[PDB]
Each structure stands twice: as C-alpha cells, then as structure tokens.
C-alpha cells in the first residue's frame, strides 16, 4: 500500500528548490507585548533545519513536497 505522509509535517515544513528544509520560527503566536521588536524580528523569519532534523522531516513526508 501507499505510504501516507505525516499531516503535521505536511502543514509545518517546506522544501526549497535546492532540497533545504525550512520551517517557520516558533515563539511569536502570542505573549508578544514583553518581547522587544528585536525579539519579534528574530522570531518572524524562516528557519532552516539542521541535517538530522531535515532528514527526519524528509522521512516523515512520504515524498510530499511540503506545504
């Protein structure tokens, strides 16, 4: 049978043109008042995963190209 892809991984991770795995930075959904604009700038970007985490995400995606 076909292998299903992981739903959370589908919704959370992207794969770039060069095979890099990127996610959205965590920690900016709420409780933003005490955070400086510098902290929000650090948390508003797009993070590139480490090699091990990227391999795990690629295993979780059943060939799904990411969101």
């Amino acid at each position: 049978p076909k292998m299903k892809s992981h739903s959370g991984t589908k919704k959370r991770f992207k794969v770039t043109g060069s095979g890099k795995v990127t996610a959205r930075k965590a920690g900016k959904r709420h409780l933003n008042e005490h955070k400086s604009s510098r902290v929000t700038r650090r948390l508003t970007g797009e993070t590139v995963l480490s090699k091990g985490e990227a391999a795990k995400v690629k295993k979780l995606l059943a060939g799904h190209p990411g969101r």
Partner: protein, 96 residues
C-alpha cells in the same frame, strides 16, 4: 521523540491557503527557444514547443532568461515583460 514535544509539534503550522483553481504555467525560456529553433523560428506555437519539450495540454508561458538573437513569433499563453521586451528587440512578437 522520546516524550519531548517533537519538531512537528513545536514548529508552528505554516498557515495560509491553497487556491482551489490555481493553474500552473508550463514555462519555456529564451535560451531553450533559441536552441530548439536556431534557424530563426518564424512562427513557433504550442505544438512546436510541445514536440520539442513543454509538456503539452497546459498553458505555455514563455520567460526571458537568455538572449534570443533570432526573430520569432511565439503565439503562446501569457509571457513575462522581460521576455516580451527581448522578443520585440530581436524583432519578433507574441500573441494570445
């Protein structure tokens, strides 16, 4: 992950949405057009770019990375501004 909140839970969900009616433009470049129609392709068409390679039964947008030293009449579905500018500079045209 051993009980630690796993990456696929700690990372925030990329939100957004998908366009239900999004169409994807098969793209051909001026490098490829020049290479596959070197003898000054007079009137290239969707069928001609398909017999070369455009993956037919799709819209056949033409993009403009290249030089296009020849004169060519593209007759395709949509084109980029730089591609159009290069085409009229070389002396060709686009249609549709």
């Amino acid at each position: 992950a051993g009980g630690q909140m796993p990456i696929h839970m700690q990372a925030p969900k990329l939100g957004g949405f998908h366009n239900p009616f999004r169409t994807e433009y098969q793209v051909v470049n001026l490098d490829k057009v020049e290479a596959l129609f070197p003898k000054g392709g007079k009137i290239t068409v969707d069928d001609l770019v398909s017999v070369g390679a455009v993956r037919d039964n799709e819209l056949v947008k033409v993009l403009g990375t290249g030089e296009l030293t020849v004169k060519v009449d593209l007759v395709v579905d949509a084109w980029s501004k730089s591609a159009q500018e290069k085409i009229e500079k070389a002396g060709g045209s686009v249609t549709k």
